[PDB]
């Protein structure tokens, strides 16, 4: 287990998301589905030049899995996945610039729903989640588990859990008052409204 401090800007963005009064919390789903779609595009683009990349899974899809018992919503995709380096770099200087621009825009009157336009849409997960876990598997590396309850730090460990071939899984440990995102009619309503034009199949699982 390795513990890391978030960069100053990201820690700042995260406490801003957790402490600002915002009712339109549903925007997290579109942001996560969007990131899933980008990873799926990346693996499909790599299979033109190298068809052997689809060996770890041929199917390109997105699964939405609510679990009322664990109070979790899981967003699984069979995209390109992330290596330990890709994972560390994505929480690094690449995000720093977008984070500062978005926080500057929020002062000027921009709302939290514009987060994706600055490439930091992942952090909207903290509008509904008290903890976020990210399990990822890339063809060129091992399976990794990333975790943060915010608080200025995150952990990275080699995942000992069930293998997933290739892709990324985002597990949102929902706040007690956010269990509406476990409901079928509510997830359907959000996906139909915010992510109706995704070039990949999205399956909402039942309980
Ligand atoms: C405007 N840009 C923003 C970053 C965009 C991007 C999209 C996808 C991925 N890859 C390769 C993923 O495997 C993946 C990551 C995901 C995250 C972020 C997890 C975090 C711990 C913060 C690194 N959330 N949901 C995900 C679903 C995914 O399949 C990396 C970057 C690329 C475009």
Swiss-Prot record:
The modification N6-acetyllysine is found at residues 42, 68. It is found in: Nucleus; Cytoplasm; Melanosome; Cell membrane. ISGylated. S-nitrosylated; negatively regulates the ATPase activity and the activation of eNOS by HSP90AA1. Disulfide bonds: none annotated. Changing residue 77 to A: Impaired ATP-binding. Strong interaction with HIF1A, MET, KEAP1 and RHOBTB2. Loss of interaction with HSF1 and ERBB2. Los of interaction with TSC1. ATP binds at residues 35, 77, 96, 122. It comes from the Eukaryota. Signal peptide: none annotated. Changing residue 31 to A: Strong ATP-binding. Strong interaction with HSF1, HIF1A, ERBB2, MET, KEAP1 and RHOBTB2. No effect on interaction with TSC1. Belongs to the heat shock protein 90 family. The TPR repeat-binding motif mediates interaction with TPR repeat-containing proteins like the co-chaperone STUB1. Homodimer. Identified in NR3C1/GCR steroid receptor-chaperone complexes formed at least by NR3C1, HSP90AA1 and a variety of proteins containing TPR repeats such as FKBP4, FKBP5, PPID, PPP5C or STIP1. Forms a complex containing HSP90AA1, TSC1 and TSC2; TSC1 is required to recruit TCS2 to the complex. The closed form interacts (via the middle domain and TPR repeat-binding motif) with co-chaperone TSC1 (via C-terminus). Interacts with TOM34. Interacts with TERT; the interaction, together with PTGES3, is required for correct assembly and stabilization of the TERT holoenzyme complex. This is Heat shock protein HSP 90-alpha. It comes from Homo sapiens.
């Amino acid at each position: 287990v390795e513990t890391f401090a978030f960069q100053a800007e990201i820690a700042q963005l995260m406490s801003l998301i957790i402490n600002t009064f915002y009712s339109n919390k549903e925007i997290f789903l579109r942001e996560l589905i969007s990131n899933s779609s980008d990873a799926l595009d990346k693996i499909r683009y790599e299979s033109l030049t190298d068809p052997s990349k689809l060996d770890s899974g041929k199917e390109l899809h997105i699964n939405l899995i609510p679990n009322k018992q664990d109070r979790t919503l899981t967003i699984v995709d069979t995209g390109i996945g992330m290596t330990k380096a890709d994972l560390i770099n994505n929480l690094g200087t690449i995000a720093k610039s977008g984070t500062k621009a978005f926080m500057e825009a929020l002062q000027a009157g921009a709302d939290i729903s514009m987060i994706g336009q600055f490439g930091v849409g992942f952090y909207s997960a903290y509008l509904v989640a008290e903890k976020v876990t990210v399990i990822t598997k890339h063809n060129d590396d091992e399976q990794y588990a990333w975790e943060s309850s915010a608080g200025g730090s995150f952990t990275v460990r080699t995942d000992t859990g069930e293998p997933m071939g290739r892709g990324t899984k985002v597990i949102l440990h929902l706040k007690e008052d956010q269990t509406e995102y476990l409901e079928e009619r509510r997830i359907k309503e959000i996906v139909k409204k915010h992510s109706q034009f995704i070039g990949y199949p999205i399956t909402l699982f039942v309980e």
